[PDB]
Each structure stands twice: as structure tokens, then as C-alpha cells.
């Protein structure tokens, strides 16, 4: 949870791409430069999209990160995110993340993006009832039962999945922006009671 003594970036962050991300974030000259826990505590935001990162090992020592942009990497294991208790905005599109149990304790998370991860089973997301924004487009999802617990969602994208049953969305009265194009939907009866929708996209269903 903390680095005890000043330590070279490249020792804390074994993924060479992620070490370079941290070096640039802290405006250091080299990944051989040492950092203190106090310097790591100064990091509020990491922008590391499209960076060829395979592991974010070391990120556990960044307790104050609130915004994390990791779209377009080579992640499979997000366990090092487990205890990032202040994370509010998390972008993980275009990785291959399937085990969502590491997200359970991100109790301050407001926005989660997991587009284009090949995901089918989203039952782990039941553990994030405080979410306000959730982006799951371009996956292999059929069963959205668990999203009925996410009663604070105001923006939800499920576009380009394999959903036919949207009954679990019926109770989500705070939804404002709902993106359901490119699914298998023919029956929207359960959405009839949503009163706060501003955007509801349903283009290009494939009935079945």
C-alpha cells in the first residue's frame, strides 16, 4: 500500500510502458529516477490510452488517483486497481478484461467504461450500485439482470451487444441517456415508465 523509501520508477512499475507513463506524469528525466510515496500521492490523473500497457502493477501505490484513462492497452488483470478507493472515472475500453471482481471495492466510482473487451458476463458489476455512467458497448452481453441494482445510473450504453431482454432496466428511473442500438430488441414495454429519458437510441436491431 505504500513505498517505504524512495525507489526507482522502473522497480515499482515493472511494465516498461507503464513506467514511462509514470515518468512522464511526474515530469521525471528517466525511469531510473527514484520517487517517494509523497510524489506518488500527488498523482490525481493518469492519461495512458493507446500505450501498449500489459500490466498496471505498481498503481496500487497511487492512493489519490481519481481519473484513470487506460483505453486501448493489453490489460487482462486489473487486480492492482482493487484498493484505489478514490477512483471516480475509469476508462478501460479495448482491453481483454473479464474478471470484474477487482472492481467491487471502487466505492467512489462514478463512471466506468469497458467497451470492446469481449465481455459476456457482467454480473460483477452488481457491486457498483453508486455508478452514474456505464459504457458497455461492443461486447457479447446478453443478460443485464444485475444492472437493475444500479439505481443511480443516468447514462448507460449497451449498444452492439446481444440483448433481447431489457426488463431489468424498468426500475432505473434516473436514466437520462440510454444507448441500445445493434442488439436483438423487439419489446420496449418495460421502458414505458422511464420518465427522465432525453436520449434513447434503438437503431439497427436484429430481431431474434
Amino acid at each position, epitope marked *: 500500500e505504500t513505498i517505504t523509501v524512495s525507489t526507482p520508477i522502473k522497480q515499482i512499475f515493472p511494465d516498461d510502458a507503464f513506467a514511462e507513463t509514470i515518468k512522464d506524469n511526474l515530469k521525471k528525466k528517466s525511469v531510473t529516477d527514484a520517487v517517494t510515496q509523497n510524489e506518488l500521492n500527488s498523482i490525481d490523473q493518469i*492519461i495512458a*490510452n493507446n500505450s501498449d500497457i500489459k500490466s498496471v502493477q505498481g498503481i496500487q501505490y497511487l492512493p489519490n488517483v481519481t481519473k484513470l*484513462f487506460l483505453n486501448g492497452n493489453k490489460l487482462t488483470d486489473i487486480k492492482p486497481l482493487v484498493n484505489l478507493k478514490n477512483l471516480g*472515472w475509469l476508462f478501460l475500453d479495448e482491453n481483454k478484461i473479464k474478471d470484474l471482481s477487482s472492481l467491487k471495492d471502487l466505492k467512489k466510482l462514478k*463512471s466506468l467504461s469497458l467497451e470492446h473487451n469481449g465481455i459476456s458476463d457482467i454480473n460483477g458489476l452488481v457491486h457498483l450500485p453508486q455508478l452514474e*455512467s456505464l459504457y458497455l458497448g461492443n461486447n457479447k452481453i446478453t443478460d443485464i439482470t444485475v444492472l437493475s441494482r444500479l439505481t443511480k445510473l443516468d447514462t448507460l450504453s449497451l449498444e452492439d451487444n446481444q440483448i433481447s431482454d431489457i426488463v431489468p432496466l424498468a426500475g432505473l428511473t434516473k436514466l437520462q*441517456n440510454l444507448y441500445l442500438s445493434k442488439n436483438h430488441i423487439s419489446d420496449l414495454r418495460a421502458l414505458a415508465g422511464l420518465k427522465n429519458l*432525453d*436520449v434513447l437510441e434503438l437503431f439497427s436491431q436484429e430481431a431474434l
Partner: nanobody
Amino acid sequence: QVKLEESGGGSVQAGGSLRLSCAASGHTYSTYCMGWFRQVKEREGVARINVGGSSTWYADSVRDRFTISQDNAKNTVYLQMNSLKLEDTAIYYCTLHRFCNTWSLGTLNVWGQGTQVTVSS
């Protein structure tokens, strides 16, 4: 791929008004968030609208002086800046994202080139 065509700005006397416009092309979105950030310090959101929807957002410092509106068919938004104040002097940038809650972050947006607005007196 997405072009943001911006117009408007310049110099205006305090208490006066200016209108900015921004037109998006090359996107595929039925609905999307478009509006302005400004920068003097760190950039900050000013106002946005969901083009193809209706929802708007304003920064507290401009509410009730600035009005944002859309022409959905022309993929254009307009910022009517009334009651201009010295504190409004900044570079204003049109900016776009499919999703308004992400638009607010800036980081993932399409960014225009920006226009200088200077308020005098």
C-alpha cells in the same frame, strides 16, 4: 475524422455580447455532446448541449448570462454570450464527445482550434 468549424470571438466591451458557433462534420452520431471549454490556468467547461437531445449544462459562473442552443439538422451549436464580464476573457474552444458525462472531462474529446475572446473595461 471529425471537423469542428468555429466562428466568432474577438474584442468586446464589458456588458456587451458575442455569439460563437461551432459546426461538426465527419461524425456518425445520432446524438452527441457539443459545446465550449475556455482557458486563461487550467481549461474549464463553459456550456454544452446534447445535439439530437435537449439537455444542457452551464458552468455556475456563466449561468443566466450565456445561452447555448442547437440546430440539429445543421450539426451546429451556438453560444450567445451576454452581459460579458472581464473574467470571461479567455480562449474558447468548441469540443465534442458522444457522451455528455465524458465530455465534461475534456481528455477524450475532439477539440477545435479555439478563438480568443477579450472583454475590455
